[PDB]
């Protein structure tokens, strides 16, 4: 599978966009947490289907398939969130019908810090002019880099080759190609940071009983 062909399989694996669904009502710490957990649960169902559509992911051991999805889920969600918000300065596009402002994060205690992190990282992706095909590779790399091992090292290498190929297709200088690749992978650390913070907050909100004990979202949060 050439890098173009692999990029195409990722384009085709793309999960469908989740619509939030709500009977109106304004924002309180419990209501916002409710909407976010409702969105994430539906998105996780589709994320498992997306991963399955990545060539070679089903060839990995069940242990490895479960390992990668359980470690990276919050990071994959926030990447999708960041990508949806790229053309919307100062806003977080959770769903077409759920657009949150920075100042709206003052609702839930602990959420503001995460909102700021995601907004800063989205602004960095905006600055870099992240392309849809770069987003496709970066997101799949997030899944695979949350670490048989030969099949995983191969699949991670193939997605990385595809990204390098995507950057070369822009016609930019070799020095600038290495710099863009480094600039995109340096932000992976920021995605992990926001994710670590998001997950710590989710445990906190459940400990405080702000939001109820979930189904597939709770499974991901636990093991």
């Amino acid at each position: 599978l050439s890098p173009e062909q692999l990029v195409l399989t990722l384009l085709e694996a793309e999960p469908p966009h989740v619509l939030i669904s709500r009977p109106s009502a304004p924002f309180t710490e419990a209501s916002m947490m409710m909407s976010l957990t409702k969105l994430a649960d539906k998105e996780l169902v589709h994320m498992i289907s997306w991963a399955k559509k990545i060539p070679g992911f089903v060839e990995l051991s069940l242990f490895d398939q479960v390992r990668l999805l359980e470690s990276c889920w919050m990071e994959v969600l926030m990447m999708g969130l960041m990508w949806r918000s790229i053309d919307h300065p100062g806003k977080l596009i959770f769903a077409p019908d759920l657009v949150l402002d920075r100042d709206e994060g003052k609702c839930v205690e602990g959420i503001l810090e995460i909102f700021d992190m995601l907004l800063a990282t989205t602004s960095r992706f905006r600055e870099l002019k992240l392309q849809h095909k770069e987003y496709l590779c970066v997101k799949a790399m997030i899944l695979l880099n949350s670490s048989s091992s030969r099949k995983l090292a191969h699949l991670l290498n193939a997605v990385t080759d595809a990204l390098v190929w995507v950057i070369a297709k822009s016609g930019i200088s070799s020095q600038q190609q290495s710099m863009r690749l480094a600039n995109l992978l340096m932000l992976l650390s920021h995605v992990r940071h926001a994710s670590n913070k998001g997950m710590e907050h989710l445990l906190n909100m459940k400990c405080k009983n702000v939001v109820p004990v979930y189904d597939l979202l709770l499974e991901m949060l636990n093991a």
């Binding site: 498992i48 479960v66 999805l69 359980e70 189904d215």
Partner: peptide
């Protein structure tokens, strides 16, 4: 749990 049903059970 549910992830080992979705990952095992095909579509």
């Amino acid at each position: 749990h549910l992830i080992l049903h979705l990952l095992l059970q095909d579509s």
